[PDB]
Design a protein that fits this description.
part of a larger assembly; 8 chains; A mainly alpha (25); B mainly beta (81); C alpha+beta (96); D mainly beta (153); E alpha+beta (214); F alpha+beta (91); G alpha+beta (98); H alpha/beta (127); E: 214 residues; alpha+beta; 26% helix; elongated; G: 98 residues; two-stranded antiparallel sheet; two-stranded antiparallel ribbon; 2 helices; binds magnesium ion; binds zinc ion; RNA-binding; ribosome; Candida albicans; hygromycin B
Chain lengths: 25, 81, 96, 153, 214, 91, 98, 127
Amino acid sequence: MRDKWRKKRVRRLKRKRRKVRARSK
Amino acid sequence: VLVQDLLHPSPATEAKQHKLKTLVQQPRSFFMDVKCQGCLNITTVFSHAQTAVTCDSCSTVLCTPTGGKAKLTEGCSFRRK
Amino acid sequence: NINSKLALTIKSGKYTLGYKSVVKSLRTGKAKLVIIAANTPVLRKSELEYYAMLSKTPVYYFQGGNNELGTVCGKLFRVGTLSILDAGDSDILSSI
Amino acid sequence: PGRGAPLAKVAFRDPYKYKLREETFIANEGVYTGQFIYAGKKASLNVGNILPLGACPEGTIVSNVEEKVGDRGALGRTSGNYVIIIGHNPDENKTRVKLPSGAKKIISSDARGVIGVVAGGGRIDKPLLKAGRAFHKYKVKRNSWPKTRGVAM
Amino acid sequence: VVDPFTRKDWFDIKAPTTFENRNVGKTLINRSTGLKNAADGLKGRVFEVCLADLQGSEDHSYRKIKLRVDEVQGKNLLTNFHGLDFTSDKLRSLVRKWQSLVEANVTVKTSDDYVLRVFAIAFTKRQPNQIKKTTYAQSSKLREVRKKMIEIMQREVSNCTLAQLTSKLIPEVIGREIEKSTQTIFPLQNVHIRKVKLLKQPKFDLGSLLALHG
Amino acid sequence: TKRTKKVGITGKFGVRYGSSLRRQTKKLEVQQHAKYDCSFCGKRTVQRGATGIWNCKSCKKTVAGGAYTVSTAAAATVRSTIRRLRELAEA
Amino acid sequence: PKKRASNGRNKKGRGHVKPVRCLNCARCVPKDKAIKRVTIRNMVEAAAVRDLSEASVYAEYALPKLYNKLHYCVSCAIHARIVRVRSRTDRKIRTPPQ
Amino acid sequence: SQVFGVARIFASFNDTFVHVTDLSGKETIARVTGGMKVKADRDESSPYAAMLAAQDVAAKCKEVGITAVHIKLRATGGTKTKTPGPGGQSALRALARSGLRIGRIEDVTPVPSDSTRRKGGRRGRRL
RNA sequence: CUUGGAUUUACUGAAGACUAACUACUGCGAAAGCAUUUACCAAGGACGUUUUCAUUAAUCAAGAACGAAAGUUAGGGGAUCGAAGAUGAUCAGAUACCGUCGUAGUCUUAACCAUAAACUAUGCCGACUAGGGAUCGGUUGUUGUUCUUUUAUUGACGCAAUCGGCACCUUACGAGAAAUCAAAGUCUUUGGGUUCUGGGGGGAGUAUGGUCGCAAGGCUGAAACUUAAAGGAAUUGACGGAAG
Ligand SMILES: [Mg+2]
Ligand SMILES: [Mg+2]
Ligand SMILES: [Mg+2]
Ligand SMILES: [Mg+2]
Ligand SMILES: [Mg+2]
Ligand SMILES: [Mg+2]
Ligand SMILES: [Mg+2]
Ligand SMILES: [Mg+2]
Ligand SMILES: [Mg+2]
Ligand SMILES: [Mg+2]
Ligand SMILES: [Mg+2]
Ligand SMILES: [Mg+2]
Ligand SMILES: [Mg+2]
Ligand SMILES: [Mg+2]
Ligand SMILES: [Mg+2]
Ligand SMILES: [Mg+2]
Ligand SMILES: [Mg+2]
Ligand SMILES: [Mg+2]
Ligand SMILES: [Mg+2]
Ligand SMILES: [Mg+2]
Ligand SMILES: [Mg+2]
Ligand SMILES: [Mg+2]
Ligand SMILES: [Mg+2]
Ligand SMILES: [Mg+2]
Ligand SMILES: [Mg+2]
Ligand SMILES: [Mg+2]
Ligand SMILES: [Mg+2]
Ligand SMILES: [Mg+2]
Ligand SMILES: [Mg+2]
Ligand SMILES: [Mg+2]
Ligand SMILES: [Mg+2]
Ligand SMILES: [Mg+2]
Ligand SMILES: [Mg+2]
Ligand SMILES: [Mg+2]
Ligand SMILES: [Mg+2]
Ligand SMILES: [Mg+2]
Ligand SMILES: [Mg+2]
Ligand SMILES: [Mg+2]
Ligand SMILES: [Zn+2]
Ligand SMILES: [Zn+2]
Ligand SMILES: [Zn+2]
């Protein structure tokens, strides 16, 4: 896939990890 | 040119070189004796003068500074010292 | 430009700084020039130039305030007015 | 109290009898104590002066403008607000102005106004932060605070 | 259904005496009725006619004059000067590459209080012996020429009435003086007053206008 | 020492009201408690009374200003605009 | 690899050049990179230059020209044959076609 | 001599306007468009439709008394193309060949001084 | 959208943007960037200099200033384009390309962000090695040239030198895998000074910790595991809804 969209996919997926981890803050 | 006399360059081509690019660097400027038309008083003036030089007798400007050589006013004759 | 001429007078000549000194110097005729800051009160200003008119002293109106007039004179304080008693190496008197 | 704009007390002489008249003007920003205020048709374009609308060129910033000739000020009286003069119609003796709400109004050119912006502007930029601050704000205005929601009654 | 052209009345357009061929042409308007007169709804019209037509000569083919009607006398329309402009093609033919274009404008009022904006344009001239491809003037010279343009337009307009100026515009008096005045700054070519706009007119004086019509 | 890292004067409000309201308050409340330079005597002795009121301790001149600064940008713009428009009218 | 020493534009000793819109597709293209052609065409086609001169009320009236400067992006120009693909050695030639 | 109108011809790439006014331009004498002569949108700007449009304009001009016109051709201008449409060339030739007399000719396209932003986006219209 | 007069036409007015043509293998700036006039404010390179000081210097972890666009916060503005969104088409399907509307945004004032193929994919200082014609800035000698004004002390142009720039053309002593390079040369005949970075391809700029940020995100940054290639330049062919 396009390198720019692969980075966007990971950025959106990094966003999910942060929100999920925040549950157990 | 593989062989060339670097120690004795032709004085014609030596004079076309930049002032810092001669064998021994030498200024191309000089000092002048300026006769204003109004009176007769020796005043030594640098060729590339940056000052509006005035003669002692009458407060009249002899030269105006420029980018390079100073420009002598009308009626002023110079002789290189 | 006038600032450079005034700075030389402070370095070499004689002067008084302040309203009380300037009025005394106008009374004795020892003043050569009176310099008034831009933000000087008009009542004090119109009185200072009445003393100078009587004393026959030219007055120069500085363009900056008393904060800027002090630092031109090399001072760390405010100068609302000053009088030049002796213009020394400078030629401020010849340029008004 | 109750006003965001400070008020200025300006003393004039009475033209007809030996007496001082103290007027209460809305202070424009830059007006100082001891300043001379000039009011009339022939007054000059200086901050704090009161001029007829026809004597001010387009783009003149003016405050405490009269809605009607001689009502002594109706428009642009709160802190930070002003009126911009848009243009003139000298044949009908009328002037177009822009009000703080953004509305364009046509006023008689003989109506007067005070040059400048009303002082105290920028007041709304700060949060009140407390119910008590609003209590004290309306303590010298009127009984309009606090408001119960009609849906909760 | 009605053929609205049966109710139209034709009027003749007369140019001021500053031009030669004063018979500009014809216009029409709804015929004067009881409610609305034809006269009042007819004044204020602007006609754009080529200056070559107003003078016969084709040397003025690149200038077009706006004429404003401001008095009606029967079937004759008494027009006045409303503006000046160049044709679009003439300007496009003057703006070449490898040269500098310099423009200036100034707002100035005439003797009779006609407020105008006058636009001047000029180009650098290539010398007959010039070898280099381009003809560029240094920005300092262009500032002096631009300054020279403004003070000439200001001088030659405020000292005369609008009618004399109209007689000045036709032979490029101002353009010839700018070229002469800037000779010591930089050689110039195609010095033209490329546009004149009327901004403000004085209070209407029918007697002054009537003198401009014979 | 430095007592607070960032709250500064709004440390009097503790943890209440929200950080955005406290940092917005801090900006405007430093300005309203500052000392400004007097245009009359030249000293930096001008302080606010109520909103729009700015007094000088030295020469006792009071000037009408903004709610939280002696002069707002809008007034400075109007001051130069009026100065400019005054020149044309008076030639 | 690098195809052209000029990078397909005319930017040397410069950081940024403001863009222009292609006449054909309105694509933003830098001013130095755009393929520019200056055209001075007769406003009336040669078939009609006679009858329009006869219909003219002016004896010996010269018809004005139509002056236009056209700006194209790379895709529009190649498609419209404004520029063509040249051989590797012929690309370097930048004199106007004879 | 002749009685002049002004033929304001607006020739875009989707239509062709043949509009004759008086000298002032405030009075319209005849306005026939290429779209009044055809029922297909694709050839509203065709040269054939412009010639028919010009002929109807010339016929209307004759019965009102207009014997000659000045030509002010224009394109769409603005942010769009400055070249005139295909119908502008036909309407001019048709007017000259219809017995009408021709005066001055000028291009009056609205040409900006670098103005507002043009439809299509940064990447243009992709086809 | 239109007989409720659309579109078009002339005249007039109001808003915001933006500075066409002149505009170039031209200029300036550390870079990002900078294009209407004039005024004001403070800078800058080059050139000229028989002025002055005398090693004050070169490159630089840490740390600072600036940093397109987009984006964030709060006011103001909101003409035009226009993410999102809504819509008409096309299609097998089309949330898209195309068309019509359109909100944030686009502009501005105070703060944030600190990223771009932020490119010359090419660090900076110093020396040398090769010819040529153009061009910008400065200086110095000189015309069958035009012009102030009639000429000079006008300005332009022309011919030579030179220093500095933006570039370009030819050659290859020399380099390179080649494409190509006046530097990418003076490198097995290997050392002028100095900063930063890479060590097969992925996993991966991922996880985690730290730090900056209001957020979006920025900086620093692994490992497990997997694989015999991945990749660069060029040649021939094949193919192309590319050109001749
Ligand atoms: Mg969940
Ligand atoms: Mg003091
Ligand atoms: Mg009331
Ligand atoms: Mg209550
Ligand atoms: Mg409630
Ligand atoms: Mg409520
Ligand atoms: Mg209840
Ligand atoms: Mg001169
Ligand atoms: Mg303590
Ligand atoms: Mg390729
Ligand atoms: Mg540079
Ligand atoms: Mg860049
Ligand atoms: Mg760039
Ligand atoms: Mg190109
Ligand atoms: Mg159509
Ligand atoms: Mg149609
Ligand atoms: Mg139809
Ligand atoms: Mg395509
Ligand atoms: Mg330039
Ligand atoms: Mg421009
Ligand atoms: Mg930005
Ligand atoms: Mg941005
Ligand atoms: Mg933004
Ligand atoms: Mg906003
Ligand atoms: Mg749109
Ligand atoms: Mg959509
Ligand atoms: Mg839907
Ligand atoms: Mg659908
Ligand atoms: Mg990066
Ligand atoms: Mg690049
Ligand atoms: Mg040179
Ligand atoms: Mg000699
Ligand atoms: Mg001169
Ligand atoms: Mg000169
Ligand atoms: Mg590796
Ligand atoms: Mg993982
Ligand atoms: Mg945080
Ligand atoms: Mg390959
Ligand atoms: Zn002497
Ligand atoms: Zn004070
Ligand atoms: Zn395109």
